[PDB]
From a paper:
MAT (methionine adenosyltransferase, also known as S-adenosylmethionine synthetase; EC 2.5.1.6) is the only known enzyme that synthesizes SAM (S-adenosylmethionine), the principle methyl group donor and precursor for polyamine and glutathione synthesis. The function of MAT2A is further dependent upon an interaction with the auxiliary subunit MAT2B, encoded by the MAT2B gene. MAT2B was proposed to modulate the catalytic activity of MAT2A by lowering its Km value for its substrate Met and the Ki value for its product SAM.
Limited proteolysis is a valuable tool to remove disordered or flexible regions in purified proteins, and can assist in crystal lattice packing. The purified truncated polypeptides, found to have molecular masses of ~28 kDa (subtilisin-treated hMAT2B) and ~32 kDa (trypsin-treated hMAT2B) by MS, were subjected to crystallization trials. The subtilisin-treated protein (hMAT2Bsubt) yielded diffraction-quality crystals allowing its structure determination at 2.2 Å resolution in the unliganded form. The hMAT2Bresv and hMAT2Bsubt structures are highly similar to each other (RMSD <0.35 Å), and can be structurally divided into two domains constructed from discontinuous stretches of the polypeptide. Minor structural variations between the two structures are found in a loop region of the second domain (residues 282–289, loop C), forming an extended coil in the hMAT2Bresv structure and a two-turn helix in the MAT2Bsubt structure. The hMAT2Bresv structure did reveal a head-to-tail dimeric packing for the two NCS-related protomers within the asymmetric unit, but it probably represents a crystallization artefact for the following reasons: (i) the C-terminus involved at the interface is partly derived from the vector-encoded sequence (AENL; residues 335–338), (ii) no equivalent dimerization is observed in the hMAT2Bsubt crystal lattice, and (iii) size-exclusion chromatography of full-length hMAT2B does not reveal a dimeric species in solution.
Residue numbers in the entry: 28 to 59, 78 to 94, 114 to 324
The structure:
Amino acid sequence: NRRVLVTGATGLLGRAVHKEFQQNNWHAVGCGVHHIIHDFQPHVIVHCAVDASGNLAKEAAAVGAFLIYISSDYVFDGTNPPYREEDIPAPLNLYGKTKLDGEKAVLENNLGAAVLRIPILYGEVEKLEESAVTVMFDKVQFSNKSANMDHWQQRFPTHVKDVATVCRQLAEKRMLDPSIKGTFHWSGNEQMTKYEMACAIADAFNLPSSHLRPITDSPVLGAQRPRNAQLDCSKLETLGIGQRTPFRIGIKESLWPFLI
Ligand SMILES: [Cl-]
């Protein structure tokens, strides 16, 4: 009788996490929440999102639940990759600052909580817009118009199923190890720009890619972005935790229903 509560269970990552636990002998309940936490008494809470997060950390502490707060590589300035969990964060934008404030809010209100920083995600989306990787597909698929692709920012596309497996593995290790707490990193091992991802998508579905224009210049509009906020995963790898899907396989599985 192992119980897990997955917040944001309707989202891309939430659905993968909920299903990973459920298919591996866990009684999984998903939220699309203080009453649910008392009635279910979950052993583990996987939070997919600051005042609410900090309040959820208190609720988790009160029932003795292992809380996993999902965070981002955007907490780092991406000037000196790779980034260890012991490295000092320096968020360049509001997204990174909110995630870092979220982490602090959780770790300050729950001493046994874990933070899992992950990079750009993709998976079996219901809508192309659900992922910043999958939203590109129609620009790749249709060659009638030239399409500018970022070839400046270094990313590590990670399958939500990899993040889901790591969440379950971290939760299962914690069950027999109370030292499992603090900050953790998980990421795919393939360094790719949006242009390199578009190229990999084109090749996976045997599509023409000559209409794709790589933009190698630094951004000139919008919020400041980390060039290479690569996460090092030695911490989890030493613990025997991890799963990594090759992008060319993971993106084929994910985008197959949207091929026109
Ligand atoms: Cl923006």
